[PDB]
Amino acid sequence: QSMTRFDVLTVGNAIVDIISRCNDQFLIDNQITKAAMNLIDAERAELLYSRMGPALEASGGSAGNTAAGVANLGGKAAYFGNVAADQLGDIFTHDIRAQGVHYQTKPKGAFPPTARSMIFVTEDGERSMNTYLGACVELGPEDVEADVVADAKVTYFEGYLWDPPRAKEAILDCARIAHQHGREMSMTLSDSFCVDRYRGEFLDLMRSGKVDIVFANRQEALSLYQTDDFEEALNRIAADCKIAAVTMSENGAVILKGRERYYVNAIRIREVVDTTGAGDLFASGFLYGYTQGRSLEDCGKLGCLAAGIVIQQIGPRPMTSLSEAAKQAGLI
Amino acid sequence: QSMTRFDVLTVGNAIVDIISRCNDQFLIDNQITKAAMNLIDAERAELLYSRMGPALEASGGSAGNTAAGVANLGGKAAYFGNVAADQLGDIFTHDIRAQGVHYQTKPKGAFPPTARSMIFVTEDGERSMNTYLGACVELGPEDVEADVVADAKVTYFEGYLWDPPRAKEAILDCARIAHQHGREMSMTLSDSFCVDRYRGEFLDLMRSGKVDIVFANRQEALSLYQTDDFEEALNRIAADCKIAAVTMSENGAVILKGRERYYVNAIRIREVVDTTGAGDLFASGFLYGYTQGRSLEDCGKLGCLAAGIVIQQIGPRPMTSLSEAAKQAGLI
Numbered sequence: 001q002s003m004t005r006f007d008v009l010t011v012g013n014a015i016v017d018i019i020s021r022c023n024d025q026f027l028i029d030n031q032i033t034k035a036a037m038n039l040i041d042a043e044r045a046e047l048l049y050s051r052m053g054p055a056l057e058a059s060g061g062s063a064g065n066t067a068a069g070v071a072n073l074g075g076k077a078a079y080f081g082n083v084a085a086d087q088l089g090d091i092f093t094h095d096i097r098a099q100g101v102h103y104q105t106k107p108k109g110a111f112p113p114t115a116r117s118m119i120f121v122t123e124d125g126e127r128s129m130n131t132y133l134g135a136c137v138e139l140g141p142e143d144v145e146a147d148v149v150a151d152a153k154v155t156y157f158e159g160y161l162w163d164p165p166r167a168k169e170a171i172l173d174c175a176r177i178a179h180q181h182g183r184e185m186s187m188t189l190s191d192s193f194c195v196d197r198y199r200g201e202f203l204d205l206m207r208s209g210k211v212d213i214v215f216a217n218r219q220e221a222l223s224l225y226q227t228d229d230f231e232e233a234l235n236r237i238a239a240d241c242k243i244a245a246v247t248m249s250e251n252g253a254v255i256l257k258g259r260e261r262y263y264v265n266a267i268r269i270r271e272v273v274d275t276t277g278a279g280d281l282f283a284s285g286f287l288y289g290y291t292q293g294r295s296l297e298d299c300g301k302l303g304c305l306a307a308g309i310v311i312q313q314i315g316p317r318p319m320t321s322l323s324e325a326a327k328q329a330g331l332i
Numbered sequence: 333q334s335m336t337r338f339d340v341l342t343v344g345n346a347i348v349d350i351i352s353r354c355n356d357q358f359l360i361d362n363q364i365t366k367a368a369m370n371l372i373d374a375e376r377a378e379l380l381y382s383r384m385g386p387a388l389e390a391s392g393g394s395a396g397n398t399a400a401g402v403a404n405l406g407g408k409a410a411y412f413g414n415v416a417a418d419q420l421g422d423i424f425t426h427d428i429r430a431q432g433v434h435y436q437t438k439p440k441g442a443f444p445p446t447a448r449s450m451i452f453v454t455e456d457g458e459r460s461m462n463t464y465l466g467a468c469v470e471l472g473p474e475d476v477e478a479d480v481v482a483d484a485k486v487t488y489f490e491g492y493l494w495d496p497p498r499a500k501e502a503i504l505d506c507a508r509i510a511h512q513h514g515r516e517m518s519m520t521l522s523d524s525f526c527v528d529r530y531r532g533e534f535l536d537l538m539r540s541g542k543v544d545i546v547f548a549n550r551q552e553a554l555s556l557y558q559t560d561d562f563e564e565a566l567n568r569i570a571a572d573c574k575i576a577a578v579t580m581s582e583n584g585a586v587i588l589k590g591r592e593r594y595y596v597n598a599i600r601i602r603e604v605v606d607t608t609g610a611g612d613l614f615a616s617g618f619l620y621g622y623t624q625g626r627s628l629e630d631c632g633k634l635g636c637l638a639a640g641i642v643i644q645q646i647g648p649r650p651m652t653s654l655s656e657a658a659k660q661a662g663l664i
């Protein structure tokens with residue numbers, strides 16, 4: 001057909017973020033692992049919320065943010081993720097659809113309720129997330145819109161999807177459909193503790209070719225091979241997947257393809273407000289560039305631009321025009 | 333007794349804000365009165381939401397913001413306002429309590445649902461609100477915690493309360509209880525169209541002595557006497573209430589008591605980001621000052637500081653420390 005309905009389909013845990021500031025002692029007092037995604041049950045969610053200061057709500061979900069970012073840039077995006085039939089679910093549905101992302105996953109009931117993450121931003125701008133999965137545990141093969149996967153240049157998913165019980169089945173279904181239709185699969189390693197949990201599974205997805213493009217930050221790449229040697233991590237990840245995009249925070253990023261390396265610089269920041277969404281938006285920029293036929297370096301540049309923008313605001317999805325910024329940057 | 337549980341009790345429509353940016357044509361296309369509080373029904377709320385871009389949620393409510401502001405400054409605050417037993421009501425309840433405000437108004441059920449206001453912020457930083465009152469229509473005399481009123485130095489309420497059916501009955505009960513215990517009553521005129529709707533009623537509250545301190549902006553003062561002569565509005569408002577605090581946006585504010593007038597300058601600002609909450613937070617600073625025995629001029633200065641802070645951020649409640657800012661500004 002070579003007119004394809006979607007550039008990027010993303011699949012992830014559909015989450016509403018609940019965002020507040022705290023001091024670092026707050027994290028110690030509450031045994032929250034700093035800079036990480038901390039899974040919590042319903043009881044702990046109530047407890048942490050009762051200790052949290054006044055907050056702001058914003059639609060989140062790592063892959064949700066990535067899909068929103070692609071649409072913002074001007075690409076055609078779709079999302080699979082499960083919310084509940086509740087007000088948080090309505091908020092999530094509105095936000096992603098209002099950005100121009102195709103989102104048609106039907107809620108299954110009011111319980112478990114829509115996933116939320118209590119995100120605590122410390123003075124350094126680091127974020128520490130405390131996520132109750134709620135309705136995310138219900139995502140499964142029944143939620144795969146086969147025609148959408150078939151009609152999407154790239155299907156991208158979260159490592160985080162290995163926590164709920166049935167999501168991985170949906171992903172395997174996606175990989176089959178995408179590849180039978182000549183499309184590509186991509187994943188993010190998500191979080192270094194997530195990598196600790198599913199290391200063998202993730203390596204298997206890469207080595208079997210179910211995943212073609214892998215996103216990682218330094219911490220995740222190191223965790224993947226249980227090494228403190230970043231150069232080893234880079235060499236191995238390159239051997240394990242067709243393309244790897246490895247972010248290094250303020251040190252930019254490196255794109256790896258076989259023996260090719262392409263290094264990109266980070267944009268010089270005024271002040272880091274909140275790092276929430278940085279990796280998500282790097283992926284939006286990269287995949288937007290990738291599905292527009294841009295060079296790997298230019299994909300990296302677009303990722304860095306989008307990540308740099310998101311970290312200068314509160315909230316995980318840029319409130320400003322990424323396409324406008326990309327035009328100004330000569331990235332177009 | 334000479335110990336009082338509360339400095340300021342506030343009473344208002346309990347609302348969660350849904351905040352987005354729009355261009356000025358959006359307001360025209362949707363027939364939204366710029367800079368005003370536009371009341372909407374359920375059907376309209378759904379329509380407007382469907383046309384709204386991605387949004388952020390934050391606890392609002394004019395008097396809610398004012399109570400939160402007083403508590404942020406270090407005063408002792410309480411709030412009466414009615415939410416539903418739903419997720420938006422839970423968010424509202426959390427945010428105001430987490431600020432250290434006494435909030436004990438019991439939801440009556442899930443329906444009508446918790447009030448929300450779609451607030452569109454234009455490029456000039458002006459905010460245009462579209463409010464579905466939902467559970468606010470249920471606030472009545474049954475919600476008056478008589479001991480809280482009796483133990484508060486000042487009970488402050490919104491003119492906006494004249495829209496729901498029975499809220500005014502609660503306010504009359506508050507006025508009786510406050511004055512029988514030697515406390516003071518205060519109101520804000522809220523909005524110039526709200527003044528158009530309830531002009532006679534508001535003047536009656538002031539002239540009968542049920543209200544002692546009145547807050548108004550320029551537009552509201554002009555509306556109250558249906559005049560284009562600001563000097564006349566000031567002279568008349570000073571005649572109608574014991575104390576009047578009249579704000580003039582970038583021109584600061586004037587405090588009137590009998591024949592006394594006290595002019596206070598606006599603080600220097602970086603940028604008008606979002607004007608939402610300006611008037612609310614002016615009242616926070618004024619009423620905190622007032623209940624700490626500060627002079628009327630210093631009350632005005634504390635108001636202008638709190639207002640100028642809130643307009644430089646997204647959302648109606650300052651995310652930073654007002655007491656620290658007050659100390660730093662030498663108001664202490």
Ligand SMILES: Nc1ncnc2c1ncn2[C@@H]1O[C@H](CO)[C@@H](O)[C@H]1O
Nearest residue numbers: 013015060061062117131160277316
């Ligand atoms: N378990 C999880 N799965 C997917 N996304 C998550 C999880 N926990 C937090 N998030 C999202 O991570 C985003 C930041 O990358 C936040 O917007 C937050 O919603």
Ligand SMILES: Nc1ncnc2c1ncn2[C@@H]1O[C@H](CO)[C@@H](O)[C@H]1O
Nearest residue numbers: 345347392393394449463492609648
């Ligand atoms: N009808 C209403 N009554 C009380 N407060 C309102 C109303 N409509 C909007 N608001 C609030 O006014 C605040 C700005 O002053 C916002 O936080 C918003 O929640």
Ligand SMILES: CCc1ccccc1CO
Nearest residue numbers: 045046049116419422423
């Ligand atoms: C909706 C706010 C919230 C967050 C975590 C746990 C419980 C609640 C209340 O519904």
Ligand SMILES: CCc1ccccc1CO
Nearest residue numbers: 087090091377378381448
């Ligand atoms: C809570 C989001 C919202 C806002 C206005 C009108 C309807 C809805 C749907 O829940």
Ligand SMILES: [K+]
Nearest residue numbers: 274276310315
């Ligand atoms: K951010």
Ligand SMILES: [K+]
Nearest residue numbers: 606642645647
């Ligand atoms: K504001």
